[PDB]
Structure formats: structure tokens, C-alpha cells
Design a protein around this motif. Structure first.
Motif, PDB file in Angstrom:
ATOM      1  N   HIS A 190       4.808  -0.076  -0.074  1.00  0.00           N
ATOM      2  CA  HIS A 190       5.395  -0.715   0.990  1.00  0.00           C
ATOM      3  C   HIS A 190       4.191  -2.118   1.474  1.00  0.00           C
ATOM      4  O   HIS A 190       2.987  -1.797   1.709  1.00  0.00           O
ATOM      5  CB  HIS A 190       5.925  -0.051   2.174  1.00  0.00           C
ATOM      6  CG  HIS A 190       5.275   0.840   2.742  1.00  0.00           C
ATOM      7  ND1 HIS A 190       4.800   1.933   2.217  1.00  0.00           N
ATOM      8  CD2 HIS A 190       4.654   0.796   4.225  1.00  0.00           C
ATOM      9  CE1 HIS A 190       4.092   2.665   3.006  1.00  0.00           C
ATOM     10  NE2 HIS A 190       4.011   1.865   4.059  1.00  0.00           N
ATOM     11  N   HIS A 202       0.823  -1.127   0.010  1.00  0.00           N
ATOM     12  CA  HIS A 202       0.019  -0.003   0.048  1.00  0.00           C
ATOM     13  C   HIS A 202       1.042   1.301   0.044  1.00  0.00           C
ATOM     14  O   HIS A 202       2.107   1.131   0.384  1.00  0.00           O
ATOM     15  CB  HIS A 202      -0.961  -0.027   1.243  1.00  0.00           C
ATOM     16  CG  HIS A 202      -0.252   0.377   2.528  1.00  0.00           C
ATOM     17  ND1 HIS A 202       0.542  -0.794   3.189  1.00  0.00           N
ATOM     18  CD2 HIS A 202      -0.080   1.351   3.305  1.00  0.00           C
ATOM     19  CE1 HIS A 202       1.092  -0.023   4.461  1.00  0.00           C
ATOM     20  NE2 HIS A 202       0.740   1.073   4.279  1.00  0.00           N
ATOM     21  N   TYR A 211       8.151   5.642  11.974  1.00  0.00           N
ATOM     22  CA  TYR A 211       7.904   4.463  12.596  1.00  0.00           C
ATOM     23  C   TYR A 211       8.923   4.147  13.511  1.00  0.00           C
ATOM     24  O   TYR A 211      10.066   3.760  13.104  1.00  0.00           O
ATOM     25  CB  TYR A 211       7.627   3.474  11.585  1.00  0.00           C
ATOM     26  CG  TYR A 211       6.445   3.058  10.922  1.00  0.00           C
ATOM     27  CD1 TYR A 211       5.056   3.036  11.651  1.00  0.00           C
ATOM     28  CD2 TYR A 211       6.191   2.820   9.661  1.00  0.00           C
ATOM     29  CE1 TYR A 211       3.837   2.824  10.910  1.00  0.00           C
ATOM     30  CE2 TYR A 211       5.031   2.700   8.820  1.00  0.00           C
ATOM     31  CZ  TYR A 211       3.980   2.744   9.662  1.00  0.00           C
ATOM     32  OH  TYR A 211       2.773   2.538   8.996  1.00  0.00           O
ATOM     33  N   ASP A 261       0.781   4.995   1.650  1.00  0.00           N
ATOM     34  CA  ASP A 261      -0.009   5.842   2.748  1.00  0.00           C
ATOM     35  C   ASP A 261      -0.958   7.050   2.481  1.00  0.00           C
ATOM     36  O   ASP A 261      -0.571   7.747   1.384  1.00  0.00           O
ATOM     37  CB  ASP A 261       0.831   6.032   3.928  1.00  0.00           C
ATOM     38  CG  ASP A 261       1.554   4.836   4.788  1.00  0.00           C
ATOM     39  OD1 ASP A 261       0.710   3.857   4.526  1.00  0.00           O
ATOM     40  OD2 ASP A 261       2.713   5.014   4.783  1.00  0.00           O
TER      41      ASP A 261
HETATM   42 NI    NI Z   1       2.036   2.067   5.494  1.00  0.00          NI
END
Ligand code: NI
Ligand SMILES: O=C(O)CCC(=O)C(=O)O
Lengths: 68, 329, 10
Positions: free
Chosen positions: B249, B177, B187, B179
Motif C-alpha cells: 500500500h 510498502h 489505522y 509493513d
Molecule cells: Ni503502512
């Protein structure tokens, strides 16, 4: 007088082309903005003036948009 | 699912090198200005990043109490990649259930905990604060008026996408996907680890992506097998990762983990951000999975730029007065 | 059934 990154100049140009080209029902002009057309006009002017931005003087290490 | 995950985890065929491994002190605004935040970044320790995190042995039960037992949480059903909902008390029970008695694989990647007790416990990298559109462009008095800690659209005063808690059990997988709104992501791996696949947002790749989304038949195709170059890479606890706008990713969870992270738009890769938004438009992504108030934010971005440079405001008088009042604080 | 936004998910 101020120097923007090509990254910014290109994006702001995409931004204004996008936003100006949306119909009314998808434009999403938010509550705070006074006259959207006057803003677009001003952006285009600004962009012309900043076209001559020196790429190495742009590397100031601090963003151009910041709160007072 | 039709392809074999164990093999995707095992092969060396995902051997591209996209990531810059970096010192925290080097990730500053000059770096952003010069490179346009085009490359995924990894910080193997937190030094000079500006981050704050909770107690190292923070548990999901502690998360539950900060945000509330009764709060509804979006939970992904891993085997369908579809969403369901439960309360945090129920999520906690599921998460605390021993690995063999857990009937199904479930993942939580979308608990936004701003405006709860938890929020002061987490700080994102300083550099992100300097460039985040939410912090730097959205009118501040609207942002500060936010009281609701869930993501209920009608109570939302600003795009509430800054601080997510992710709680994944061993074996969790989130399929490929991009974002929302082509936001970039930071992250931090608090406990456990993660494995990412990364595919660069070239024109060709983004066309394959869009086509894959329109196909529907997606549990069938491992998109990392369709592209010229893909990097698989493991984040270990303590690492901080930054994904640039538009990067495709997918993520696997090898051990029980807890991640703190957040999303942000910024002024240095607007064209990719616009490109992603319009893929979402074309593939009909429902609103709930999109960046809130996106075009609204874009308008405010233009106004800030013009004002900071030329000192001509295009905000209403009321909005200027509100801004003036907070400058006086 | 209050609508939400900003929900991360593929
Ligand atoms: Ni993501
Ligand atoms: O960590 C995961 O399981 C997925 C993280 C992610 O990429 C997302 O939340 O969009």
C-alpha cells in the motif's frame, strides 16, 4: 480433542520448519525458552494429533492461546 | 519523483474492490477463525469495535506535551522518502506553520507513544487485543517491565509496535510498502482523511514488489500501474481501517491529519508474515525498520501453543514462576 | 546514536 483452524495448523507447520532450519547465529532462541529442540519435537507431535481438526468445531469464537 | 501524483489521484483506473465494509460488532474472533483476516476491512463508524481515542480537538501540541518536547521523532522527508530526525517541539512548530510558509513536505508516521500519558487515551479494537502476539505470547513480566517510551532497541523489553501516532500535513505521500514483518495494521482517522492504494499480496505481486525494491529506481515507477488490479480508496475521519498481512500500500494525505494506529502479528496468517520477513532479509532492510525481536516472538508463540493445548511448558523454571505470579494477581 | 527498532518507513 481440540480443534484448530487450518489457518493455524498450516502456519504452525511453517513456523516450526522455519525456526528449526535456521542456523544457530540467526535462530534467536530467547532467554525464556529452556530446550528449543524439545519444543520443536513437541510441536510436530501436536500437529499430527491436530491434523484431524474438524473445520466447523474450530470456529469457537475464542482463541486457543489465552492467559489463565 | 518522476511520475505524476495528481493523476494517480484523479484516474478511475484503480477500480478493484478488495475492501469489506463492516460493522464493528462483526469483527470478532469467529470472524478471524473463519476468514483468516485475509481482506482489508473498513468500519465507517467505531460502534462495537472497542476503541477509545482522545478529545476530538486534540492537537499536535497536546501530543507534544504527552510525549515530551525533547523527544526525538523520526520524520520522513516526502520528496526523498528518506528519514531525518527532530525533537517533537520542532515537529510541532513545523506542523503549526501555515501551509505556504512550510518550506518542505515532512511526514511523521512512526511516533510510538506507549509508556507515556498518551497511551491510556488510545484503545485499539478489542478483537486485536485477543489475537496480538505481543499481548498473548510475549512473557508478560518482560512486557510490563518496559519503562522507556522511545524505541531505543537496547531499552526494549518487548516488540514496541502497538500504538503509533501519525501526523501528516496536506500533500504528504508515503510510497508503496509492506509493513514490517508482515504485520497487520489498524489505522483510525482522528482528524482529516487519507487516500490509500492497495495491491494484494499475490505471489506475482510480491515478486514485482521485491524486484521494485531491489531496483532502487523507485521514484520512477508507480507500482499501482504494474499490477492487474489495484484499489484506491479514501478514508474519512472516524473510519477505522485494517490492512491484512503482506498487503502492498501507498498513502496520500489530502488535508492536515492525525491518525492513531498500530501493528500486530497474529496466528492466522503466519506464512505471509514469514514471507514478508524474508523479503526484508533479501532486500537488506536495515534493522531499525524491522519488527523487533521477530524470531524471538516466534519461539514464544510455539511454546504458548504447546502449553495451552498440552500443558507441557518449555519455558525456564524462572519464567514459569514469573508467569504463575501474574496469574495470581 | 542509540539504535532504534520498530521504525515505520518505506
Ligand atoms: Ni503502512
Ligand atoms: O499514513 C501514512 O502517511 C502512511 C501510513 C503507513 O502505511 C505506515 O505508517 O506504515
Amino acid at each position: 480433542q481440540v480443534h484448530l483452524t487450518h489457518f493455524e495448523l498450516e502456519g504452525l507447520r511453517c513456523l516450526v520448519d522455519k525456526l528449526e532450519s535456521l542456523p544457530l547465529h540467526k535462530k534467536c532462541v530467547p532467554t525464556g525458552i529452556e530446550d528449543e529442540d524439545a519444543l520443536i519435537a513437541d510441536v510436530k507431535i501436536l500437529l499430527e494429533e491436530l491434523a484431524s481438526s474438524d473445520p466447523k468445531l474450530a470456529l469457537t469464537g475464542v482463541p486457543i492461546v489465552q492467559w489463565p | 519523483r518522476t511520475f505524476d501524483l495528481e493523476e494517480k489521484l484523479q484516474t478511475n483506473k484503480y477500480n478493484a474492490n478488495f475492501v469489506t465494509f463492516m460493522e464493528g460488532k462483526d469483527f470478532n474472533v469467529e470472524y478471524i477463525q473463519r476468514g483468516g483476516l485475509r481482506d482489508p476491512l473498513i468500519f465507517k463508524n467505531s460502534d462495537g469495535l472497542g476503541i477509545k481515542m482522545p478529545d476530538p480537538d486534540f492537537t499536535v501540541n497536546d501530543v507534544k506535551m504527552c510525549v515530551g518536547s525533547r523527544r526525538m521523532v523520526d520524520v520522513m522527508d516526502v520528496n526523498t522518502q528518506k528519514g531525518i530526525e527532530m525533537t517533537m517541539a520542532q515537529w510541532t512548530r513545523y506542523y503549526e506553520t501555515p501551509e505556504e510558509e512550510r518550506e518542505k513536505l515532512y511526514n511523521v508516521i512512526s511516533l510510538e507513544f506507549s509508556h507515556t500519558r498518551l497511551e491510556n487515551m488510545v484503545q485499539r479494537p478489542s478483537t486485536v487485543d485477543f489475537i496480538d502476539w505481543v499481548d498473548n505470547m510475549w512473557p508478560r513480566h518482560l512486557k510490563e517491565s518496559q519503562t522507556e517510551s522511545t524505541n531505543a532497541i537496547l531499552e526494549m523489553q518487548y516488540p514496541k509496535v502497538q500504538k503509533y501516532c501519525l501526523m501528516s500535513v496536506r500533500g504528504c505521500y508515503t510510497d508503496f510498502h509492506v509493513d514490517f514483518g508482515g504485520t497487520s495494521v489498524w489505522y483510525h482517522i482522528h482528524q482529516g482523511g487519507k487516500v490509500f492504494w492497495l495491491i494484494p499480496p499475490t505471489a506475482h505481486n510480491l515478486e514485482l514488489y521485491e524486484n521494485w525494491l531491489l531496483s532502487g529506481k523507485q521514484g520512477d515507477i508507480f507500482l499501482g500501474d504494474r499490477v492487474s488490479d489495484c484499489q484506491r480508496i479514501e478514508l474519512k475521519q472516524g473510519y477505522t481501517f485494517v490492512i491484512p498481512s503482506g498487503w502492498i500500500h501507498a498513502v496520500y494525505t489530502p488535508t492536515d491529519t492525525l491518525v492513531f494506529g498500530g501493528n500486530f502479528l497474529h496466528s492466522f496468517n503466519i506464512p505471509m508474515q514469514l514471507k514478508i520477513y524474508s523479503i526484508e532479509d533479501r532486500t537488506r532492510v536495515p534493522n531499525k525498520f524491522r519488527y523487533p525481536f521477530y524470531y524471538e516472538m516466534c519461539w514464544y508463540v510455539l511454546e504458548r501453543y504447546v502449553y495451552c493445548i498440552t500443558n507441557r511448558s518449555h519455558l525456564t523454571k524462572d519464567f514459569q514462576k514469573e508467569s504463575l505470579s501474574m496469574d495470581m494477581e | 546514536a542509540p539504535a532504534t527498532g520498530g521504525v515505520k518507513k518505506p
